[PDB]
Amino acid sequence: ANSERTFIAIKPDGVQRGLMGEIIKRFEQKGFRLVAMKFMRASEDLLKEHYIDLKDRPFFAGLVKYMHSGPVVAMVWEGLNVVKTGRVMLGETNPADSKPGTIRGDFCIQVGRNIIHGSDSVESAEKEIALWFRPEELVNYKSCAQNWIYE
Amino acid sequence: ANSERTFIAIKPDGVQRGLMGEIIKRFEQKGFRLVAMKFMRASEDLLKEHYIDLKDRPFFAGLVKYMHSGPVVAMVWEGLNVVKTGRVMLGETNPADSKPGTIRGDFCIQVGRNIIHGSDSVESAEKEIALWFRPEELVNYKSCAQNWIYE
Amino acid sequence: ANSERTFIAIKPDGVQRGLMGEIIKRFEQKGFRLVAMKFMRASEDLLKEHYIDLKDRPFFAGLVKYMHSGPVVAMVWEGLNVVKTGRVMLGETNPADSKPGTIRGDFCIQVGRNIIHGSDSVESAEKEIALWFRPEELVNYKSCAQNWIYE
Amino acid sequence: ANSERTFIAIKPDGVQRGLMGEIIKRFEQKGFRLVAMKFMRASEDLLKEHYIDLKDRPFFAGLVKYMHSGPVVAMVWEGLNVVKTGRVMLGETNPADSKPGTIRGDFCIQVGRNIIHGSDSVESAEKEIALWFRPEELVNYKSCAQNWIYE
Amino acid sequence: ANSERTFIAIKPDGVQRGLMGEIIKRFEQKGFRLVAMKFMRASEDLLKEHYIDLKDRPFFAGLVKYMHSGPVVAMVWEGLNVVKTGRVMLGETNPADSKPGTIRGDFCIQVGRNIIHGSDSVESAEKEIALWFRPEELVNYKSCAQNWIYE
Amino acid sequence: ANSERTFIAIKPDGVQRGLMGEIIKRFEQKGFRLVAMKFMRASEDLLKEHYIDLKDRPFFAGLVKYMHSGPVVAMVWEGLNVVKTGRVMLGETNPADSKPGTIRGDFCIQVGRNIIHGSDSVESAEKEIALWFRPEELVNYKSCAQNWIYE
Ligand SMILES: Nc1nc2c(ncn2[C@@H]2O[C@@H]3COP(=O)(O)O[C@H]3[C@H]2O)c(=O)[nH]1
Ligand SMILES: Nc1nc2c(ncn2[C@@H]2O[C@@H]3COP(=O)(O)O[C@H]3[C@H]2O)c(=O)[nH]1
Ligand SMILES: Nc1nc2c(ncn2[C@@H]2O[C@@H]3COP(=O)(O)O[C@H]3[C@H]2O)c(=O)[nH]1
Ligand SMILES: Nc1nc2c(ncn2[C@@H]2O[C@@H]3COP(=O)(O)O[C@H]3[C@H]2O)c(=O)[nH]1
Ligand SMILES: Nc1nc2c(ncn2[C@@H]2O[C@@H]3COP(=O)(O)O[C@H]3[C@H]2O)c(=O)[nH]1
Ligand SMILES: Nc1nc2c(ncn2[C@@H]2O[C@@H]3COP(=O)(O)O[C@H]3[C@H]2O)c(=O)[nH]1
Numbered sequence: 001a002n003s004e005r006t007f008i009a010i011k012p013d014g015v016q017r018g019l020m021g022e023i024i025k026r027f028e029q030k031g032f033r034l035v036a037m038k039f040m041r042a043s044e045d046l047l048k049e050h051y052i053d054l055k056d057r058p059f060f061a062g063l064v065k066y067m068h069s070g071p072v073v074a075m076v077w078e079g080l081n082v083v084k085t086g087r088v089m090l091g092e093t094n095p096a097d098s099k100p101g102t103i104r105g106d107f108c109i110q111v112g113r114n115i116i117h118g119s120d121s122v123e124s125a126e127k128e129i130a131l132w133f134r135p136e137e138l139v140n141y142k143s144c145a146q147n148w149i150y151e
Numbered sequence: 152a153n154s155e156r157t158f159i160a161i162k163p164d165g166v167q168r169g170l171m172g173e174i175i176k177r178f179e180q181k182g183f184r185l186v187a188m189k190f191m192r193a194s195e196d197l198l199k200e201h202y203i204d205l206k207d208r209p210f211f212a213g214l215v216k217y218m219h220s221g222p223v224v225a226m227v228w229e230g231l232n233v234v235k236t237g238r239v240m241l242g243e244t245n246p247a248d249s250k251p252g253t254i255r256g257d258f259c260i261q262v263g264r265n266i267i268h269g270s271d272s273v274e275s276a277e278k279e280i281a282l283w284f285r286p287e288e289l290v291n292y293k294s295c296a297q298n299w300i301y302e
Numbered sequence: 303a304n305s306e307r308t309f310i311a312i313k314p315d316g317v318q319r320g321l322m323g324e325i326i327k328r329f330e331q332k333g334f335r336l337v338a339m340k341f342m343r344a345s346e347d348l349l350k351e352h353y354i355d356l357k358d359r360p361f362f363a364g365l366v367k368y369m370h371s372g373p374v375v376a377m378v379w380e381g382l383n384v385v386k387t388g389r390v391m392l393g394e395t396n397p398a399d400s401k402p403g404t405i406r407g408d409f410c411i412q413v414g415r416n417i418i419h420g421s422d423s424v425e426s427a428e429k430e431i432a433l434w435f436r437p438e439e440l441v442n443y444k445s446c447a448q449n450w451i452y453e
Numbered sequence: 454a455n456s457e458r459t460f461i462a463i464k465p466d467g468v469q470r471g472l473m474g475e476i477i478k479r480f481e482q483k484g485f486r487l488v489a490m491k492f493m494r495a496s497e498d499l500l501k502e503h504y505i506d507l508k509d510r511p512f513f514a515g516l517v518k519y520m521h522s523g524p525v526v527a528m529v530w531e532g533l534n535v536v537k538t539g540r541v542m543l544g545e546t547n548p549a550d551s552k553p554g555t556i557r558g559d560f561c562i563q564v565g566r567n568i569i570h571g572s573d574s575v576e577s578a579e580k581e582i583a584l585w586f587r588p589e590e591l592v593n594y595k596s597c598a599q600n601w602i603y604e
Numbered sequence: 605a606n607s608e609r610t611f612i613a614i615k616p617d618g619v620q621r622g623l624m625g626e627i628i629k630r631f632e633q634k635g636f637r638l639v640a641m642k643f644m645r646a647s648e649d650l651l652k653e654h655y656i657d658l659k660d661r662p663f664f665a666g667l668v669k670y671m672h673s674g675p676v677v678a679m680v681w682e683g684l685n686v687v688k689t690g691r692v693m694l695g696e697t698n699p700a701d702s703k704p705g706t707i708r709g710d711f712c713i714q715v716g717r718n719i720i721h722g723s724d725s726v727e728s729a730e731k732e733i734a735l736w737f738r739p740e741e742l743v744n745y746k747s748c749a750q751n752w753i754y755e
Numbered sequence: 756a757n758s759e760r761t762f763i764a765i766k767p768d769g770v771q772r773g774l775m776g777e778i779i780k781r782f783e784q785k786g787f788r789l790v791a792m793k794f795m796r797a798s799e800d801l802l803k804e805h806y807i808d809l810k811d812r813p814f815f816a817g818l819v820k821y822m823h824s825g826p827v828v829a830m831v832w833e834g835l836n837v838v839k840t841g842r843v844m845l846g847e848t849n850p851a852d853s854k855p856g857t858i859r860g861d862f863c864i865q866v867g868r869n870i871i872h873g874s875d876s877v878e879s880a881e882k883e884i885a886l887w888f889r890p891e892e893l894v895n896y897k898s899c900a901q902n903w904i905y906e
Pocket of ligand 3: 418
């Protein structure tokens with residue numbers, strides 16, 4: 001299940017804030033593997049289809065707006081239990097609740113300014129990933145050490 | 152209400168131990184604003200009122216001595232729920248119980264050499280701040296990050 | 303003139319080395335804006351095209367080779383003097399003369415496995431980008447600290 | 454009681470992972486004195502002896518196995534409460550429940566490849582050392598900041 | 605003569621940019637002793653005398669403005685050839701020319717946003733120190749590290 | 756020549772200072788491989804045979820003395836050109852001359868308090884290594900990536 005994959009976006013702040021590598025490096029060092037990845041400017045349109053569930057939801061409005069407001073880091077990571085796991089590294093959605101050593105616990109404060117999103121699960125993963133990527137953008141390759149990360 | 156402030160000092164142990172740059176580094180990193188700070192040797196007087204409610208603690212004159220046994224770094228940091236948050240960053244009063252990822256957590260073993268203090272509550276913060284600093288010393292300014300951290 | 307660009311690429315071994323957020327960090331922290339970024343497999347055509355000046359020399363398709371055996375992180379970083387400075391950051395072309403502080407002087411040992419590549423002139427630069435990115439991938443945005451980095 | 458000891462070992466994958474100075478760092482920065490350290494190949498006898506409590510369970514010689522396929526960094530770290538605290542630093546035994554801040558929560562994903570090991574009682578502790586080090590390898594010295602770490 | 609001191613301030617750019625903890629962190633790291641430090645907004649008066657010899661520089665009122673455009677961190681650090689050394693750590697006046705590994709080096713692009721100042725010479729240090737600090741503010745103490753850093 | 760090996764000792768200060776991992780991690784991340792390694796207390800005797808050339812040399816006297824004065828990190832590293840290379844990472848013997856990004860440039864100040872030694876060359880390597888180690892202490896094994904470090 002080591003081929004599990006999750007979608008991680010470093011949000012507009014993430015980006016202005018200068019936490020790009022930092023974040024990426026946490027995943028790298030934990031042992032997961034970047035499958036896909038590009039720097040973009042989510043479309044309004046996308047943000048809307050991405051954020052559709054939670055559409056008619058106050059916040060909404062301006063989520064897109066800010067989400068749209070800047071370039072983000074679209075990323076796909078691979079590994080055993082990344083969805084779960086990446087969600088921990090992340091921290092709680094509201095930074096108020098995240099803790100030290102997590103991503104958001106360490107560098108952010110407030111919810112509307114969350115620095116990053118991770119899929120909430122495989123079902124999600126799939127959708128977003130599908131929704132965010134093109135088949136080709138995904139890249140098959142193997143580690144220099146699948147052996148020391150997994151048995 | 153992103154004006155809440157907190158008092159934080161860095162014990163002699165922190166100082167002697169070289170932990171400034173890192174302590175500071177974590178608050179700069181999470182996003183809070185340094186409103187004042189100086190590096191001094193606090194007086195027994197100062198310590199004694201700072202540590203007033205613990206005057207009936209046997210530790211109490213131990214603290215007071217060691218807390219005056221070398222330079223310390225006083226500071227006020229501000230931001231939204233910066234008093235709770237800071238605490239959490241801090242670790243727990245007893246290092247024994249502070250989670251890795253917390254200052255206390257990676258850096259200190261014991262209660263009496265627990266390198267740092269941060270306010271316990273906003274009233275306490277008002278106090279200590281008043282105690283430690285002249286209002287003048289506190290720097291009123293705006294953050295570049297400002298809009299990126301805050302909604 | 304804060305507009306100059308450079309093309310940075312993370313060679314397939316630096317990715318394999320879990321050196322991406324690390325090097326991406328060096329950039330960001332130096333002050334550079336990220337224009338465009340992608341993770342991917344370089345094609346033989348692109349690569350050939352890319353290494354064209356040296357189509358004869360020995361090392362050649364051993365280049366193309368390696369160069370196409372894994373993913374790279376392809377990037378475009380902006381800023382005053384990106385191209386010469388980038389350079390100086392990567393350090394020299396053969397790791398061994400690379401100096402402690404540079405990417406290469408810090409992480410890699412031999413010329414043939416030298417984690418990354420940066421355009422060596424704007425000239426090259428201009429070409430490198432042209433070749434590697436569609437234009438719809440250059441991102442147009444203003445930084446948080448434009449006016450902290452520049453006079 | 455600042456004398457308690459613990460036995461830490463860097464499993465052959467964490468070495469393979471270039472995680473040694475990293476984890477050694479976590480210790481040192483937390484405040485612990487290093488009593489004894491060695492790099493080496495664990496023998497089958499030692500290892501068998503070492504994993505004795507579990508000679509039956511499945512995972513068993515797959516332990517012994519891995520465990521003898523590479524070098525480990527064998528260490529003894531001193532200090533108040535090394536053994537429980539060490540623990541809390543490594544994080545849980547299965548990486549996935551390991552938390553961001555711990556060695557395991559930061560660097561590793563699966564139980565079977567979990568970078569390191571620490572004695573889980575002083576009891577174990579005492580045995581672990583006894584087994585792994587000759588006595589002529591425990592180093593007797595006083596720290597620079599004995600009296601900054603301890604009351 | 606391990607008493608030599610130097611003045612170092614951290615520009616508004618450094619401050620706004622979050623580089624305190626790191627700047628401090630490098631001096632704590634190399635081994636020098638922080639003798640005083642405060643965080644203030646310097647006055648044009650202050651800046652103007654500080655920057656006196658450059659009063660005939662066109663940059664001069666640019667500096668003066670920006671140097672007063674936000675809080676700064678003044679400090680005196682001491683140790684053996686701390687004035688030359690510090691400089692070297694610093695980087696070069698022009699970031700363009702400062703070697704990776706230097707503060708200037710990893711962190712700043714341009715001459716007018718070059719985040720930091722450190723004394724050019726001991727006479728200059730005496731001056732600036734006098735300028736910036738009241739003698740009282742400077743902390744006289746001894747280092748734990750003391751004998752470890754010094755013969 | 757990728758089997759070249761050099762002797763690196765983290766000196767008594769190195770040790771009290773808490774730079775153990777740090778240093779080790781520079782070698783790890785640069786790509787070299789630890790062949791041998793133990794924490795010890797050099798004998799006077801050893802220090803004498805080690806430091807014999809430069810015997811009847813003022814300094815001498817007390818070099819042993821301090822060298823002897825504390826436990827050190829005996830280490831053996833492997834890689835292409837480690838002798839040379841490790842010597843750069845190191846910095847100049849006198850820290851006064853080392854630069855930022857080097858080991859000693861970054862963390863030490865004065866010569867008698869040098870934090871570490873590296874062999875000055877293959878001839879040296881051999882001798883010290885021989886002199887410091889027992890055949891068995893050396894450990895043959897191969898990387899999880901000799902492939903991405905060397906071609
Ligand atoms: N202002 C605001 N933003 C929210 C709230 N709940 C969720 N969001 C955002 O909605 C995002 C959707 O999931 P994310 O993982 O992207 O992180 C979430 C938050 O940034 C809320 O109550 N207020
Ligand atoms: N020696 C000692 N100091 C204590 C004890 N409990 C609290 N402290 C010290 O006194 C403190 C009061 O506030 P702090 O926030 O600084 O953190 C605690 C330590 O500095 C105790 O039981 N023993
Ligand atoms: N194997 C090998 N690769 C080389 C040699 N010189 C340059 N290169 C490689 O080819 C690359 C061309 O420029 P890079 O910036 O990509 O840095 C160079 C190295 O990857 C050489 O002598 N041998
Ligand atoms: N493969 C595998 N290894 C396990 C299991 N549980 C514990 N271990 C390993 O055996 C080790 C015994 O204690 P460690 O501290 O060394 O941590 C444990 C892991 O390396 C399991 O279910 N599977
Ligand atoms: N804009 C500008 N500032 C300069 C120039 N030369 C020096 N400086 C600034 O003025 C400085 C004088 O001392 P500093 O040490 O702070 O570093 C230099 C920068 O802050 C220049 O040519 N242009
Ligand atoms: N005090 C002092 N120590 C020195 C001098 N020259 C060399 N040493 C030490 O001699 C050591 C021998 O080589 P090292 O690589 O171990 O690093 C050297 C220095 O620590 C000198 O002129 N004075």
